[PDB]
Write a protein that binds this ligand. Structure first.
Ligand SMILES: Nc1ncnc2c1ncn2[C@@H]1O[C@H](COP(=O)(O)OP(=O)(O)OP(=O)(O)O)[C@@H](O)[C@H]1O
Ligand SMILES: [Mg+2]
Length: 254
């Protein structure tokens, strides 16, 4: 596994009056630790992860890690073929690794709904899963793939999936306990159980540290966000956006 180091990092989006997508980003994450990244819509959570992978070039500062990454996108995707083929996806088959992954990702119930189990063909002529089941497969695919560093721009966080709590506890927390990983998340339980948390807004880091430090350093912010996890993904992201937007020389009425 690996360590991730960011030091005074600034980047601009090359493709496609506000300029940099990410500004003065500073964090270290120890081997086997979890970073929870939370923040407003368009803060730059996906782009931070892009930058770690090499998809985005920094104009300032250093990025350090081993360079063996598995990335999960926030958009569920499915290749034509079996559920099993979608999780394995060109990677060497191991029955114990696969089983523990599909268990952690809460797919065992879904799979057993089918007569062919995980050998059911998904696609054009086959069957179509719910966006929720497709999210579980997508995370499983990214987690089954072996890596030093796991960038989870989780599809949950923009979905309301009944069994997400179980995914986070079993997969991200326990199955992946010895992996260095980064979870983009809109849930407060995830921030509480993380080793480190990062709050991003308009390209900037408005907080980096632990949940304890957050609760202590910014209590008014904390009390506004920490039953919050019972709200829908769309609603939680709104409240977060609304709250983060107060960090300015105005801050509107509602
Ligand atoms: N490949 C790209 N090329 C150019 N601009 C991009 C690219 N990806 C993202 N951006 C821009 O950078 C800004 C921040 O994007 P990003 O997707 O990182 O936000 P985010 O925090 O992931 O938001 P959300 O929570 O809605 O996913 C956005 O305004 C977006 O238009
Ligand atoms: Mg994103």
């Amino acid at each position: 596994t690996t360590e991730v180091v960011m030091e005074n990092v600034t980047a601009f989006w090359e493709e496609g009056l506000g300029t940099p997508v990410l500004k003065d980003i500073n964090f270290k994450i120890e081997r086997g630790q979890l970073l929870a990244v939370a923040g407003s819509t368009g803060a730059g959570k996906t782009s931070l992860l892009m930058m770690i992978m090499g998809e985005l070039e920094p104009s300032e500062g250093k990025i350090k890690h081993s360079g063996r990454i598995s990335f999960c996108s926030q958009f569920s995707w499915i290749m034509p073929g079996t559920i099993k083929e979608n999780i394995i996806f060109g990677v060497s088959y191991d029955e114990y690794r696969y089983r523990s992954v599909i268990k952690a990702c809460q797919l065992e119930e879904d799979i057993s709904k089918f007569a062919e189990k995980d050998n059911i063909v998904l696609g054009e002529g086959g069957i179509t899963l719910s966006e929720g089941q497709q999210a579980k497969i997508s995370l499983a695919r990214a987690v089954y793939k072996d890596a030093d560093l796991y960038l989870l721009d989780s599809p949950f966080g923009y979905l309301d999936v009944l069994t997400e709590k179980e995914i986070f506890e079993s997969c991200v927390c326990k199955l992946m306990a010895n992996k260095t990983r980064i979870l983009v998340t809109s849930k407060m339980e995830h921030l509480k159980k993380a080793d480190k948390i990062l709050i991003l807004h308009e390209g900037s880091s408005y907080f980096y540290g632990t949940f304890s430090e957050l609760q202590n350093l910014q209590p008014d912010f904390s009390s506004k966000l920490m039953s919050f996890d019972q709200f829908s993904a769309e609603r939680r992201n709104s409240i977060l956006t609304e709250t983060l937007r107060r960090f300015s020389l105005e801050g509107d009425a509602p």
